[PDB]
């Protein structure tokens, strides 16, 4: 059972949880209700396990793609914003959190990956993936490298895999065919092959994870990385002279990043649903609540209409929304966790060499 009279919130460790905790201190000042923000490891896997038994946090934050599986298992409360509140957020962000016709979470912010480059090392970042090998050969002569990003999570390699034709689930005549998966077609194979060749020719290392790529870019050792808005604040601290721009094309086509909508769901087991609604509607989803989280770690393009004038002053956000314009909003169907687990294993096995590209993607299929 979840404790009555207070709020427990889970949010991923790469987000602005200290800023979110400041919104909870404002909530505690006005109402007396303590808000506890936690960032447990693998929380998108832990939440369905503890929530199924009636435990867990009052509120869970994650990108919208996992909430359909949570909703199918009955783990989420249907939210109840009135029409006036719904008119405060962009319509397409409400579409991201609809499952079986119902609203299952509050949209917070729109996220997309961008190419992040060191202007001192690279004033003209490349427009194509194809020219990165020659750039790396040039920078390696100077003790640098061209590109490092997280190869342990398929979210970061998906824009390249999807560029030439790869897809998750086929959508046709108003519904998905969950048996028609596009992880091993010609387009996906071409993208993953290009990634493996970058590794075979030592332009990247298969072991590179989030922490390693972040450290290398923020110390000026690599000229580019691929990351989302949450990472900009640590780059600001390192004083690297960085820019945010469009992901490179592959075979002449734009990279196709999955677009995520950071969203907040209310635990169906929570006895604090009224408090949770008040916190999310009247404290977080305000100009001053989003500002407080953003000052800690940037959210991206926040879903609240009244903030768009402020977003437009941030050129990193326009770049984020240009990459989102060339991408697709993730499905939220329950099969998404199985899709991600399959792509993650295929990328890791191919990049390491234990399997060829054809063998790995055939196993993901």
């Amino acid at each position, epitope marked *: 059972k979840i404790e009555e009279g207070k709020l427990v919130i889970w949010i991923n460790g790469d987000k602005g949880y200290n800023g979110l905790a400041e919104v909870g201190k404002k909530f505690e000042k006005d109402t007396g209700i303590k808000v506890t923000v936690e960032h447990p490891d693998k929380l998108e896997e832990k939440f369905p396990q503890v929530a199924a038994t009636g435990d867990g946090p009052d509120i869970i934050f994650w990108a919208h793609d996992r909430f359909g599986g949570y909703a199918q298992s009955g783990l989420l409360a249907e939210i109840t914003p009135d029409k006036a509140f719904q008119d405060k957020l*962009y*319509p*397409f962000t409400w*579409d*991201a959190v*609809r499952y079986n016709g119902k609203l299952i979470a509050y949209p917070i912010a729109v996220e997309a990956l961008s190419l992040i480059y060191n202007k001192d090392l690279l004033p003209n970042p490349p427009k194509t993936w194809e020219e990165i090998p020659a750039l790396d050969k040039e920078l390696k002569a100077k003790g640098k490298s061209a590109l490092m990003f997280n190869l342990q999570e398929p979210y970061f390699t998906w824009p390249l895999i999807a560029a030439d034709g790869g*897809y998750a689930f086929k*959508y046709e*005549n*108003g519904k*998905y065919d969950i048996k028609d998966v596009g992880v091993d077609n010609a387009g996906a194979k071409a993208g993953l092959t290009f990634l493996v060749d970058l590794i075979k020719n030592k332009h990247m290392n298969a072991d590179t994870d989030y922490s390693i790529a972040e450290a290398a870019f923020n110390k000026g050792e690599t000229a580019m990385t691929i990351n989302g808005p949450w990472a900009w604040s640590n780059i600001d601290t390192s004083k690297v002279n960085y820019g945010v721009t469009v992901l490179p094309t592959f075979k002449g086509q*734009p990279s196709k990043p999955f*677009v995520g909508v950071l969203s907040a769901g209310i635990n169906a087991a929570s006895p604090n649903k009224e408090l949770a609604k008040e916190f999310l509607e009247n404290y977080l989803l305000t100009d001053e609540g989003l500002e407080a989280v953003n000052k800690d770690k940037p959210l991206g*393009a926040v879903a609240l*209409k009244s903030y*768009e*004038e402020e*977003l*437009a002053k941030d*050129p990193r*956000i*326009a770049a984020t*929304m*240009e990459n*989102a*314009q*060339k*991408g*697709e*909003i993730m*499905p939220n169907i329950p099969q998404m966790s199985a899709f991600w687990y399959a792509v993650r294993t295929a990328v890791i096995n191919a990049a390491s060499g234990r399997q060829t590209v054809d063998e790995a993607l055939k196993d993901a299929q």
Partner: antibody, heavy 128, light 107 residues
Framework: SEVQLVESGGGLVQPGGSLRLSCAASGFNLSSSSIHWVRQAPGKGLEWVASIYSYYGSTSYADSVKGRFTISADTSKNTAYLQMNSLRAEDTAVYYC????????????????????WGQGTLVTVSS | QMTQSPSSLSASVGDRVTITCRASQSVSSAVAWYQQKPGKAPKLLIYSASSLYSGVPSRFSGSRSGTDFTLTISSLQPEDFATYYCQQASLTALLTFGQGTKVEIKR
């Protein structure tokens, strides 16, 4: 099978009057596309009027027509409509219907793309 | 609001032509460009700021620089004298057209 849109219903109407325009689609299923009405007053630029823009059937309107115009559609007839009430002299224009479609749209109709097929337009004159 | 500039520009066959619209208080990259001849319906040129619509000749291209979106015609052809419109789809699901630009024959 060519995609095309055909507007009808234009004519002369008195100020304060009502007029319903029709947009008949062929060569594609209207229910999987977004449908927009755009008008062009004589000698002037393009002005967007109204849209059905989402999988769930959400509509939006320009401020100058809000409360007076209603956009709707009949899926069984593959036809869209613009009901225009309380008309004014300033509503005189050629009225165009146009479709927006992206083959990768799902339940989310993102990203928003271009208006790729337009009709020939129908002329509405409001005058006494 | 999409501020299109200039309202009219004169050019010759073979010129490189540039038209720019500035978006205000907006972060959308859903920006399209249209061409319209007298008496005819508009025709789509560019969408998503920079994607060339299928069948449109290669001399047409779109780009974004901050809040400014630009249509470029690399080598103006005789059939390219017309009026051009920019258009944005806002995140609030509203459409806005620029005022338009007349490309006319210099003499």
């Amino acid at each position: 099978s060519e995609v095309q849109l055909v507007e009808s219903g234009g004519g002369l109407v008195q100020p304060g009057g009502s007029l319903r325009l029709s947009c008949a689609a062929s060569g594609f299923n209207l229910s999987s596309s977004s449908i927009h009405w755009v008008r062009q007053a004589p000698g002037k630029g393009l002005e967007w009027v109204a849209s059905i823009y989402s999988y769930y059937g959400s509509t939006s309107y320009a401020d100058s027509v809000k409360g007076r115009f209603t956009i709707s559609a009949d899926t069984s007839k593959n036809t869209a409509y613009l009901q225009m009430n309380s008309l004014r002299a300033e509503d005189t224009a050629v009225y165009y219907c146009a479709r927006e479609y992206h083959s990768y749209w799902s339940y989310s109709w993102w990203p928003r793309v271009g208006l790729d097929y337009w009709g020939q337009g129908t002329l509405v004159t409001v005058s006494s | 609001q999409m501020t299109q500039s200039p309202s009219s520009l004169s050019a010759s066959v073979g010129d490189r032509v540039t038209i720019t619209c500035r978006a205000s208080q907006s972060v959308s990259s859903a920006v399209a460009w249209y061409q319209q001849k007298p008496g005819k319906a508009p025709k789509l040129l560019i969408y998503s700021a920079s994607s060339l619509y299928s069948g449109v000749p290669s001399r047409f291209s779109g780009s974004r620089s901050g809040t400014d979106f630009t249509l470029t015609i690399s080598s103006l052809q005789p059939e390219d004298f017309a009026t051009y419109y920019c258009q944005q789809a806002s995140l609030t699901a509203l459409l806005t057209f620029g005022q338009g630009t007349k490309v006319e024959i210099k003499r």
